[PDB]
PDB file of N, CA and C in Angstrom:
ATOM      1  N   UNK R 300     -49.870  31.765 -30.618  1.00 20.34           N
ATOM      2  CA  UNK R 300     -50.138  30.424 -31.173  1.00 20.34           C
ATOM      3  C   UNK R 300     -50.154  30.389 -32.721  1.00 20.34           C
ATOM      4  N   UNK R 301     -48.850  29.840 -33.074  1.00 21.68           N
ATOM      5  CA  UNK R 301     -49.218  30.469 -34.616  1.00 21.68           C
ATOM      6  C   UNK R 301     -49.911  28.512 -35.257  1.00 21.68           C
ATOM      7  N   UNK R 302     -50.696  29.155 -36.184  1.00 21.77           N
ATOM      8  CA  UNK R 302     -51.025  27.906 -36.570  1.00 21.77           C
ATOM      9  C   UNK R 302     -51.075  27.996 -38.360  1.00 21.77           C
ATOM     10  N   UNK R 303     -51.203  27.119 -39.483  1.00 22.03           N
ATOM     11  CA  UNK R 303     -50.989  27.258 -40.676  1.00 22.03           C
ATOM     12  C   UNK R 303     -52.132  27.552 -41.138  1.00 22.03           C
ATOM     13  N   UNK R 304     -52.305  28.653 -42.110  1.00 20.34           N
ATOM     14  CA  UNK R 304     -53.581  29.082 -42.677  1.00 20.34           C
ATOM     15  C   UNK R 304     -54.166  27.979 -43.841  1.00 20.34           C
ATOM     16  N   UNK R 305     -53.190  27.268 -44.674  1.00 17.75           N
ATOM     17  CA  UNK R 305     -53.436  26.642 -45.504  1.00 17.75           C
ATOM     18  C   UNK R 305     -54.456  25.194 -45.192  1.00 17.75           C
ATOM     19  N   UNK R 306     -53.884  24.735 -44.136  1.00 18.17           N
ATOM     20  CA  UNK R 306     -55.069  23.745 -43.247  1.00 18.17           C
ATOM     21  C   UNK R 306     -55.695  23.980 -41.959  1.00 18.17           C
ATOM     22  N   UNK R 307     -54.933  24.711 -41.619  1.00 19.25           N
ATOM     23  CA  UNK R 307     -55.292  25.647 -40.376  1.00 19.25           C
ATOM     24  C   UNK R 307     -54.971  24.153 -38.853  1.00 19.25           C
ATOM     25  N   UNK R 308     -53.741  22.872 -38.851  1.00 20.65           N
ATOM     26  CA  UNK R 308     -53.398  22.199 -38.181  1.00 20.65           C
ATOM     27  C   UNK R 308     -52.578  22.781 -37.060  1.00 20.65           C
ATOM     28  N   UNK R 309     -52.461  22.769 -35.568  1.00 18.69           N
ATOM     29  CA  UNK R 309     -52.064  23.172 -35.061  1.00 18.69           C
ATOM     30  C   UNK R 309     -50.433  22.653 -34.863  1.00 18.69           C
ATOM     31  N   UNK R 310     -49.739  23.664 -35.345  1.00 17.15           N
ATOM     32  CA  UNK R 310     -48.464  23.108 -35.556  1.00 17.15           C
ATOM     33  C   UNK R 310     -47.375  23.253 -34.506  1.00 17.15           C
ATOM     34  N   UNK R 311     -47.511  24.738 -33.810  1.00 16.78           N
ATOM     35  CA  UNK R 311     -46.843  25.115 -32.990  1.00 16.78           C
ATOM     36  C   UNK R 311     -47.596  25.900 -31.803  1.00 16.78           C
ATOM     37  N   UNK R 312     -47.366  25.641 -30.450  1.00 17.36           N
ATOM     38  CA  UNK R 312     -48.551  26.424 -29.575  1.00 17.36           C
ATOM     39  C   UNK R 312     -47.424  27.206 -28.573  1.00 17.36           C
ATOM     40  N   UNK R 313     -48.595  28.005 -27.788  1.00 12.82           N
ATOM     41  CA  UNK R 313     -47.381  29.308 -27.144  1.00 12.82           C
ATOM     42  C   UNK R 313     -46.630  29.301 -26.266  1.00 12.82           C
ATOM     43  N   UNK R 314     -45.558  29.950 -26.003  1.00 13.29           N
ATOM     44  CA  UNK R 314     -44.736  29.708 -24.907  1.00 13.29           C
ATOM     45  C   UNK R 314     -44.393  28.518 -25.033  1.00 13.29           C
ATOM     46  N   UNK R 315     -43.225  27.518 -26.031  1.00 14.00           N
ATOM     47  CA  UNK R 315     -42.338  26.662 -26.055  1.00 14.00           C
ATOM     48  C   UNK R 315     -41.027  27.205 -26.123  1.00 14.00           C
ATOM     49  N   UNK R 316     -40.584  25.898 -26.247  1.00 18.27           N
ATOM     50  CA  UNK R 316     -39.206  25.622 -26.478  1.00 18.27           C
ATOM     51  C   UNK R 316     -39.071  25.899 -27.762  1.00 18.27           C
ATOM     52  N   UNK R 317     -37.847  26.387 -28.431  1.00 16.93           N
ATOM     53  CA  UNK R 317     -37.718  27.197 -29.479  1.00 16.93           C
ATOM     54  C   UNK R 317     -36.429  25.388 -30.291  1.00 16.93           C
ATOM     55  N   UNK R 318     -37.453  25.232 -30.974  1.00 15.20           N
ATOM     56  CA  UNK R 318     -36.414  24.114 -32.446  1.00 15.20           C
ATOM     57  C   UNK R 318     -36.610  24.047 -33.587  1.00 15.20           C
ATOM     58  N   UNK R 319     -35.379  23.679 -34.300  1.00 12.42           N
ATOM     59  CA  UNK R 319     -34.844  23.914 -35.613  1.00 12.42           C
ATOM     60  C   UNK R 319     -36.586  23.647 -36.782  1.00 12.42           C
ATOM     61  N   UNK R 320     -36.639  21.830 -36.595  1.00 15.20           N
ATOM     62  CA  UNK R 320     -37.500  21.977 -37.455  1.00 15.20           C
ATOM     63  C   UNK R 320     -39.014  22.177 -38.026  1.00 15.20           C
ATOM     64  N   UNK R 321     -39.536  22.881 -36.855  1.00 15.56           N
ATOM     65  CA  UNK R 321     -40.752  23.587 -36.694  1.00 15.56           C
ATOM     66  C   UNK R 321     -40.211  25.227 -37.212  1.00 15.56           C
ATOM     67  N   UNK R 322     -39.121  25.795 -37.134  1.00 16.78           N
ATOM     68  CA  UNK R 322     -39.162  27.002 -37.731  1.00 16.78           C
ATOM     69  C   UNK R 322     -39.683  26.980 -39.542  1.00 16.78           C
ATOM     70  N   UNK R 323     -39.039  25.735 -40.363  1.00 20.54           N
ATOM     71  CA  UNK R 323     -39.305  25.708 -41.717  1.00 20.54           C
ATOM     72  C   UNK R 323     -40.119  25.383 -41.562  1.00 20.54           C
ATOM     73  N   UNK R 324     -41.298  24.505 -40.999  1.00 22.16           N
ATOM     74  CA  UNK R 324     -42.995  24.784 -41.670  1.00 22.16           C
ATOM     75  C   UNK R 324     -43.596  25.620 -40.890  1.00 22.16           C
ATOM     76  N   UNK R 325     -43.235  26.620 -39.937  1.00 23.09           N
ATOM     77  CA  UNK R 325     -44.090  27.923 -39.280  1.00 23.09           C
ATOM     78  C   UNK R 325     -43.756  28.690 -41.111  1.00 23.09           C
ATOM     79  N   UNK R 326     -42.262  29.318 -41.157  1.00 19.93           N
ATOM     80  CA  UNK R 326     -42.178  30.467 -42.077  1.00 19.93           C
ATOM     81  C   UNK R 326     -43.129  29.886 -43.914  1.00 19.93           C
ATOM     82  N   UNK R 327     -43.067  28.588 -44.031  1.00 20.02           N
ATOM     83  CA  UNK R 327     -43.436  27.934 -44.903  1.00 20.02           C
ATOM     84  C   UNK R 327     -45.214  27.893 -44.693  1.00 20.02           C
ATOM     85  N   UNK R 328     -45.800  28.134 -44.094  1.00 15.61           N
ATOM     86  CA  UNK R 328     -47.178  28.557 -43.810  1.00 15.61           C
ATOM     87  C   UNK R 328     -47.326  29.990 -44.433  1.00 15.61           C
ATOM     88  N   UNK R 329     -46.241  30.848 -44.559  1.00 14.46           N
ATOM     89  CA  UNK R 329     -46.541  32.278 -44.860  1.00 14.46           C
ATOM     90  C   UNK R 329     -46.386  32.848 -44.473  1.00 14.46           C
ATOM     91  N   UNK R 330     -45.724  32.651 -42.817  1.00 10.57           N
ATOM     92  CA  UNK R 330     -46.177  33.438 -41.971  1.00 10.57           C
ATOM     93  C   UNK R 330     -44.277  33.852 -41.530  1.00 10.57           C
ATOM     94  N   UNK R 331     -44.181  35.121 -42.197  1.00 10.00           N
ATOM     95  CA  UNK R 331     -43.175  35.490 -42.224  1.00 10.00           C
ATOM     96  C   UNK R 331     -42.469  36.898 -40.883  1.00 10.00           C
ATOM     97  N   UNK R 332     -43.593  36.645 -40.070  1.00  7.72           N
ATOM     98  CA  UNK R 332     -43.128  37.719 -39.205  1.00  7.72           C
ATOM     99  C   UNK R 332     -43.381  37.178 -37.740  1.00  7.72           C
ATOM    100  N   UNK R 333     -42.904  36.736 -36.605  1.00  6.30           N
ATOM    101  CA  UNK R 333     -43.014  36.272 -35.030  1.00  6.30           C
ATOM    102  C   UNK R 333     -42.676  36.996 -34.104  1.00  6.30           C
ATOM    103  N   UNK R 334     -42.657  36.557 -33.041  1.00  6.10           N
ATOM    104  CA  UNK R 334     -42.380  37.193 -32.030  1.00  6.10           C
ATOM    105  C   UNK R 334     -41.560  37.051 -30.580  1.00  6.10           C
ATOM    106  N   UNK R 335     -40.546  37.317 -30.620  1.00  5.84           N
ATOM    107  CA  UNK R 335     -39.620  36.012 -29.966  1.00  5.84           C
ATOM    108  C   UNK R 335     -40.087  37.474 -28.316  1.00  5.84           C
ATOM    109  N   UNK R 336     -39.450  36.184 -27.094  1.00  6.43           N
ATOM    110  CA  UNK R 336     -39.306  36.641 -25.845  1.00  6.43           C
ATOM    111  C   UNK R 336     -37.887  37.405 -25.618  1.00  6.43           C
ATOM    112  N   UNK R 337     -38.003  38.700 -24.417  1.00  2.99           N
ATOM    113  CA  UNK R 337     -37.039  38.996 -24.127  1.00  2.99           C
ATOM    114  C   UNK R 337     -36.737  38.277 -22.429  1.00  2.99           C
ATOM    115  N   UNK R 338     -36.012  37.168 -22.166  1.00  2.00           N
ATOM    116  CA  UNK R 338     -36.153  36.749 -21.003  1.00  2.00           C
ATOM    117  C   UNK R 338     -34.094  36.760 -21.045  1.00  2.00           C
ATOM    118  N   UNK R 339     -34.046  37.176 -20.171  1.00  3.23           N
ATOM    119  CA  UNK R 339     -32.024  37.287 -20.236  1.00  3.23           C
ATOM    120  C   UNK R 339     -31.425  36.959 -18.825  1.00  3.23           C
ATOM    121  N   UNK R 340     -32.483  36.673 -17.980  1.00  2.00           N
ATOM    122  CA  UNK R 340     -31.904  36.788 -16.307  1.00  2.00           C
ATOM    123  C   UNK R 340     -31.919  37.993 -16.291  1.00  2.00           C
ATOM    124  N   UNK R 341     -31.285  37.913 -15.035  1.00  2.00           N
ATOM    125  CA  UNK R 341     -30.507  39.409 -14.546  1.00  2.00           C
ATOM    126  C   UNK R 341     -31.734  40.761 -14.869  1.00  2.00           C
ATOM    127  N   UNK R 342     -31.788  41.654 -15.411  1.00  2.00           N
ATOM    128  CA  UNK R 342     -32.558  42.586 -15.370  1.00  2.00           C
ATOM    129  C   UNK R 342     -34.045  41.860 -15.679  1.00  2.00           C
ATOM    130  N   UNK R 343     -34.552  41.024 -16.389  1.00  2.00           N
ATOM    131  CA  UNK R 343     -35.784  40.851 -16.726  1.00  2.00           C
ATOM    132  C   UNK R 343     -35.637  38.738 -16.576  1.00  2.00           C
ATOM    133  N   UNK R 344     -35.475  38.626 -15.815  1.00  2.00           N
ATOM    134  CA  UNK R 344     -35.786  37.171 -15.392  1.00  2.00           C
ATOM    135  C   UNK R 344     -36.990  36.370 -15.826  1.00  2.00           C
ATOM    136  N   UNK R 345     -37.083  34.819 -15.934  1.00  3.86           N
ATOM    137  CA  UNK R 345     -37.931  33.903 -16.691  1.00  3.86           C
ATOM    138  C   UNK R 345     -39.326  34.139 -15.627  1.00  3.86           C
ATOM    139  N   UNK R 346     -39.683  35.239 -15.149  1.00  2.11           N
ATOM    140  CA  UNK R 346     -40.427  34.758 -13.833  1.00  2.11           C
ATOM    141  C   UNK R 346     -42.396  34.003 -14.252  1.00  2.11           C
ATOM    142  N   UNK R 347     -42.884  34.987 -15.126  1.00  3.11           N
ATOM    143  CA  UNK R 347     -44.155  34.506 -15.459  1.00  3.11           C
ATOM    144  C   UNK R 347     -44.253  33.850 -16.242  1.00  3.11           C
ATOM    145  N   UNK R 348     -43.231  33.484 -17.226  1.00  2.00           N
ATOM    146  CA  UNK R 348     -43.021  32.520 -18.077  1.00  2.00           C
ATOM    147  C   UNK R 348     -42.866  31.150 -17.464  1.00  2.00           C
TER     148      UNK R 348
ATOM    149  N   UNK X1057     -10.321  47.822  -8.152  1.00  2.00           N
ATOM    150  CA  UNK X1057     -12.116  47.305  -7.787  1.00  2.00           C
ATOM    151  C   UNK X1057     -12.019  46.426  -6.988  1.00  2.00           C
ATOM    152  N   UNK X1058     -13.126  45.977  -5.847  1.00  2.00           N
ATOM    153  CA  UNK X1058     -13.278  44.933  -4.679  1.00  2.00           C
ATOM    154  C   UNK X1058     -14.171  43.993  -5.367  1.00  2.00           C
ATOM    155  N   UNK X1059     -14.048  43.097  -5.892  1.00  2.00           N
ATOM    156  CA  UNK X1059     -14.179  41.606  -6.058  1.00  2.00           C
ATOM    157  C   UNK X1059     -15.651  41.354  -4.669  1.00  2.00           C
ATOM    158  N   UNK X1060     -16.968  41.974  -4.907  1.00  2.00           N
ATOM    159  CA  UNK X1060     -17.655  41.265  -3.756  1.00  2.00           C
ATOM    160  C   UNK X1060     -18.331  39.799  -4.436  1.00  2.00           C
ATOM    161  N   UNK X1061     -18.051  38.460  -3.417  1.00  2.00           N
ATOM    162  CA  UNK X1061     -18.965  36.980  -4.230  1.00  2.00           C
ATOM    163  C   UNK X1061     -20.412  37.132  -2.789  1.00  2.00           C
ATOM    164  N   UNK X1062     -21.520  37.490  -4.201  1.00  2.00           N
ATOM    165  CA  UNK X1062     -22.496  37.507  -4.043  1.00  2.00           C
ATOM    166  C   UNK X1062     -23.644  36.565  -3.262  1.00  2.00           C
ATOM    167  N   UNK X1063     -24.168  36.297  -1.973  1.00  2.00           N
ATOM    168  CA  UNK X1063     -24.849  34.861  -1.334  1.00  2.00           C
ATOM    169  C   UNK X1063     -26.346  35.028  -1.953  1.00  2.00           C
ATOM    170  N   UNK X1064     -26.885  33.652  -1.643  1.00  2.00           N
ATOM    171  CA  UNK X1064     -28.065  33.615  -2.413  1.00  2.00           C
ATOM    172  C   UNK X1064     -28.621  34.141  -2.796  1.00  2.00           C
ATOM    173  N   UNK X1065     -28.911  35.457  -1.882  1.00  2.00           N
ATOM    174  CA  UNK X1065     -29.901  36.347  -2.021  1.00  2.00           C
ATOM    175  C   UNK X1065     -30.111  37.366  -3.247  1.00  2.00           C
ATOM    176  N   UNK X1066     -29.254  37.697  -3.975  1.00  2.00           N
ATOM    177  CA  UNK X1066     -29.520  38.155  -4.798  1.00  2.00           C
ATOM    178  C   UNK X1066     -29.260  37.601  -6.124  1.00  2.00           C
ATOM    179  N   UNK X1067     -28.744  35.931  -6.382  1.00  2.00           N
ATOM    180  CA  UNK X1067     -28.603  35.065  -7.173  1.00  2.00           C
ATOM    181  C   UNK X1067     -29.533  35.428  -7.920  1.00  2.00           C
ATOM    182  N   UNK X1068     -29.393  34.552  -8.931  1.00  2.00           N
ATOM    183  CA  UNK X1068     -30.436  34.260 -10.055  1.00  2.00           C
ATOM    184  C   UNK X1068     -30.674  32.861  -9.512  1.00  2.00           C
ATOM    185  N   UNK X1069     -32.017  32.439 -10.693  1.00  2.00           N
ATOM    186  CA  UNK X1069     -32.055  30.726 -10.600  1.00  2.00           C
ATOM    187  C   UNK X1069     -31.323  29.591 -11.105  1.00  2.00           C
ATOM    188  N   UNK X1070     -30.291  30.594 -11.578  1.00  2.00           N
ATOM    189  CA  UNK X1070     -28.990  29.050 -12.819  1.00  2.00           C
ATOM    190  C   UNK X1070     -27.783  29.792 -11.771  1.00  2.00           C
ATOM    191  N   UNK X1071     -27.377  30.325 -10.935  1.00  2.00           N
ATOM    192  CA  UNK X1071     -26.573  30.886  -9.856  1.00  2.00           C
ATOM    193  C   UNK X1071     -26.641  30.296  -8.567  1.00  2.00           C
ATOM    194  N   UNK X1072     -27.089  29.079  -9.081  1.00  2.00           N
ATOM    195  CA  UNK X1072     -27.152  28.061  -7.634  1.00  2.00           C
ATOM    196  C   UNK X1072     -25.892  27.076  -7.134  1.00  2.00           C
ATOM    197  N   UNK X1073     -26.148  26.552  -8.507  1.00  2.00           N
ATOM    198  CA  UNK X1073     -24.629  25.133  -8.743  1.00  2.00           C
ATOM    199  C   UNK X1073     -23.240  25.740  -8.290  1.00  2.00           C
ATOM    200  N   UNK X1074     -22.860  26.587  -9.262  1.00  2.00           N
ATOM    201  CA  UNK X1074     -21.705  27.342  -8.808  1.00  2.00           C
ATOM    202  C   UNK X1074     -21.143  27.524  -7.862  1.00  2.00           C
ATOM    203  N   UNK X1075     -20.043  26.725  -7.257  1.00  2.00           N
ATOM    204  CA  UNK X1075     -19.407  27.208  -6.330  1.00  2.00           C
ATOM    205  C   UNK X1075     -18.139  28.093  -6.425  1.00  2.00           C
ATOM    206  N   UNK X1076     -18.090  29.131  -5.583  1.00  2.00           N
ATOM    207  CA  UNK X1076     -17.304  29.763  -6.063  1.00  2.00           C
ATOM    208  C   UNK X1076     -15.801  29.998  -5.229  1.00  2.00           C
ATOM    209  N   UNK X1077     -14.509  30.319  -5.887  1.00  2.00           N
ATOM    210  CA  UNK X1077     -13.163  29.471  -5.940  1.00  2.00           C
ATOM    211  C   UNK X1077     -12.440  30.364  -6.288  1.00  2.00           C
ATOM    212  N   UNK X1078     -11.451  30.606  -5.819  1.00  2.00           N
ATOM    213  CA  UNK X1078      -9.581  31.274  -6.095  1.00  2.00           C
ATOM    214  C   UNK X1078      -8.476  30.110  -6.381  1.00  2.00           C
ATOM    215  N   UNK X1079      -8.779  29.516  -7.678  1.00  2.00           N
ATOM    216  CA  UNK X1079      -7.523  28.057  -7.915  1.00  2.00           C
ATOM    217  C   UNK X1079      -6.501  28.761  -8.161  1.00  2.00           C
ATOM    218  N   UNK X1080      -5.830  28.340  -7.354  1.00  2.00           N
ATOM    219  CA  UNK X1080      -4.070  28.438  -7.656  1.00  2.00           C
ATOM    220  C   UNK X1080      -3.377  27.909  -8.142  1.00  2.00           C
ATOM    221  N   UNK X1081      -2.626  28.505  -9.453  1.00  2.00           N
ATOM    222  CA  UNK X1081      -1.869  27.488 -10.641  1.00  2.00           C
ATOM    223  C   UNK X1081      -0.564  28.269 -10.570  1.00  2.00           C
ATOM    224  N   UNK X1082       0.009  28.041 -11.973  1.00  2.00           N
ATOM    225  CA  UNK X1082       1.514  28.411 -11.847  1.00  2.00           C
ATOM    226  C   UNK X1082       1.657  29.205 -13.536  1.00  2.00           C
ATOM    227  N   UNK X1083       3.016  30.043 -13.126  1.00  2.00           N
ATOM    228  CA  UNK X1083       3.206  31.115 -14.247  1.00  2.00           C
ATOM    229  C   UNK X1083       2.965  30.490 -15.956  1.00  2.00           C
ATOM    230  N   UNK X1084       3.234  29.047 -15.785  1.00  2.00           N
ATOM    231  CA  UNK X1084       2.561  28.191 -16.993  1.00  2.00           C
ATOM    232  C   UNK X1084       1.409  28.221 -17.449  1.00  2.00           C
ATOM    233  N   UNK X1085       0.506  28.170 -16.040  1.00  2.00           N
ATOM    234  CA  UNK X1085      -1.117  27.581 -16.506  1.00  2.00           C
ATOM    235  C   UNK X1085      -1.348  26.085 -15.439  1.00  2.00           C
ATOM    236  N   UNK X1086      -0.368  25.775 -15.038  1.00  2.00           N
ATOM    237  CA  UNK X1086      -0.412  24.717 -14.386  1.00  2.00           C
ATOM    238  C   UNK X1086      -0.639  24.579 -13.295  1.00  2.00           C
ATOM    239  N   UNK X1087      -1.578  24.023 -12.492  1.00  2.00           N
ATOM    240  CA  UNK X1087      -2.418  23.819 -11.501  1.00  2.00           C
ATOM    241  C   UNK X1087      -0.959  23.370  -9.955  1.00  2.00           C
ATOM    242  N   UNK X1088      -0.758  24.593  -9.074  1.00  2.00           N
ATOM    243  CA  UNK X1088      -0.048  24.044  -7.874  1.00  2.00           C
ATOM    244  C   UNK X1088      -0.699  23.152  -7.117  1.00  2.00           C
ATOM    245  N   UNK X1089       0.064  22.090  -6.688  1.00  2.00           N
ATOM    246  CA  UNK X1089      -0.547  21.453  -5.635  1.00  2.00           C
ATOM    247  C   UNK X1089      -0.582  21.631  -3.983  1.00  2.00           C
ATOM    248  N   UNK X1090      -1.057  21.348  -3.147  1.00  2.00           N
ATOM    249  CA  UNK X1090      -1.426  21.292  -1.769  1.00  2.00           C
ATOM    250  C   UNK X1090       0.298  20.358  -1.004  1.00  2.00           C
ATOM    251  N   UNK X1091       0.533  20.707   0.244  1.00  2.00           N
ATOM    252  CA  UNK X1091       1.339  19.762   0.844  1.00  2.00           C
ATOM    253  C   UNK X1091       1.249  18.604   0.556  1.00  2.00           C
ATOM    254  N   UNK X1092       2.264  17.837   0.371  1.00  2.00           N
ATOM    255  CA  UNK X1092       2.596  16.341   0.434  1.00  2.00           C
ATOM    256  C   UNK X1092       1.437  15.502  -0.140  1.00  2.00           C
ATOM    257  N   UNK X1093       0.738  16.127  -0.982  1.00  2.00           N
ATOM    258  CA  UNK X1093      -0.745  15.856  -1.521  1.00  2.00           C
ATOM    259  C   UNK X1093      -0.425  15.948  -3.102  1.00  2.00           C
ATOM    260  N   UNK X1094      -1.190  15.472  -3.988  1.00  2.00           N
ATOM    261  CA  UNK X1094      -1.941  15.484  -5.113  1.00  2.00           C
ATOM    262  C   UNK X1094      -2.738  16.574  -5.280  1.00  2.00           C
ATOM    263  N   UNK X1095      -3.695  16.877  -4.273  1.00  2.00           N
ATOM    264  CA  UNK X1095      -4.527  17.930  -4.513  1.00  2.00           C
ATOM    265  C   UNK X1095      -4.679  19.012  -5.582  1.00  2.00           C
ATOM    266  N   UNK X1096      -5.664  19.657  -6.624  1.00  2.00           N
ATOM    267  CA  UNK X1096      -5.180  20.973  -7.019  1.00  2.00           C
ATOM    268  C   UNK X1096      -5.887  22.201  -5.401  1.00  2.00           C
ATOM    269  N   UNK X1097      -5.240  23.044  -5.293  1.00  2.00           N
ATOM    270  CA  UNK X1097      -5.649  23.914  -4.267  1.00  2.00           C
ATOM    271  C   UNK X1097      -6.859  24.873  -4.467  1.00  2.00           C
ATOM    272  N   UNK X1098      -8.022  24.772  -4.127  1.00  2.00           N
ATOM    273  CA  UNK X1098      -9.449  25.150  -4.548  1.00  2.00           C
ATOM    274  C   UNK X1098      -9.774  26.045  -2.876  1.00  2.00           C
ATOM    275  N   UNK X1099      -9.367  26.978  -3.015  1.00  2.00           N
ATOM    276  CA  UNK X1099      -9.834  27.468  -1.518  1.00  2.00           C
ATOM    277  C   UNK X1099     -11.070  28.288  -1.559  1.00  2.00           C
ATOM    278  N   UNK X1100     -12.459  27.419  -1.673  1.00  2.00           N
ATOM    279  CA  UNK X1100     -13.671  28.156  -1.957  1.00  2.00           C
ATOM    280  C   UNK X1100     -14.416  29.355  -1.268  1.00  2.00           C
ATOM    281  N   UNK X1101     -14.559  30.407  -1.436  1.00  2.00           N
ATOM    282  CA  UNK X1101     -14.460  31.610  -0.422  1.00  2.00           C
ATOM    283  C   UNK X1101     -15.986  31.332  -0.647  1.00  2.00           C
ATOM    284  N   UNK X1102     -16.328  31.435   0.500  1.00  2.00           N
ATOM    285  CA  UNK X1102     -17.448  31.416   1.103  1.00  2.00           C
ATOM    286  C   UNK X1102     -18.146  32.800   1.259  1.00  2.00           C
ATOM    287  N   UNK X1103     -19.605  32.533   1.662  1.00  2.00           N
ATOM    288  CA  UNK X1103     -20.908  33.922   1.538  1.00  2.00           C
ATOM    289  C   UNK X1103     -20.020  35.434   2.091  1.00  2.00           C
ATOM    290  N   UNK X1104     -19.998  36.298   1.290  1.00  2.00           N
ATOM    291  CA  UNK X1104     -20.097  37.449   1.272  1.00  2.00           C
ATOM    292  C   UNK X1104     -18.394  37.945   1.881  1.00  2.00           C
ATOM    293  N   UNK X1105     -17.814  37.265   1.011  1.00  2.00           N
ATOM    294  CA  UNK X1105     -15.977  37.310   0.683  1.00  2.00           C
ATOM    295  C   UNK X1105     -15.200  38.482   0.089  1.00  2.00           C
ATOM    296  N   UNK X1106     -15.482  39.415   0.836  1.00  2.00           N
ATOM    297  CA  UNK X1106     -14.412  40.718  -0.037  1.00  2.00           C
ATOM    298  C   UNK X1106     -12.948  40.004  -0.376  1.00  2.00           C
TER     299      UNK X1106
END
């Protein structure tokens, strides 16, 4: 759940959908390092997600 | 190699829609047709088709 330290507003919460313009104010918070999913089908499928 | 088309069972969940097909076209690219028909020829091989 990353959220912005500067006001600390909840901007983005876990396990979404991945879009364009929530990436420029996540990295624009500071917060320069995430953590993306490995979900591909086939060997490791969407299952608990 | 033998060409096996795979039945539900070991699908995925986006491996549903798909039906699966041997279309027959021509040395062009161009789709043959069926007897005395319009048709393009779609002969969909069905569960577990060597």
């Amino acid at each position: 759940d990353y959220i912005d330290e500067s006001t600390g507003e909840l901007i983005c919460a876990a396990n979404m959908e991945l879009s364009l313009d929530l990436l420029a104010k996540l990295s624009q918070s500071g917060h320069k390092r995430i953590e993306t999913l490995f979900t591909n089908d086939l060997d490791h499928g969407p299952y608990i997600s | 190699s033998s060409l096996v088309v795979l039945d539900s069972a070991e699908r995925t969940a986006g491996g549903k829609d798909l039906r699966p097909a041997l279309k027959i076209v021509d040395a062009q690219g161009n789709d043959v047709l069926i007897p005395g028909t319009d048709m393009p020829a779609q002969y969909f091989l069905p569960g577990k088709a060597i």
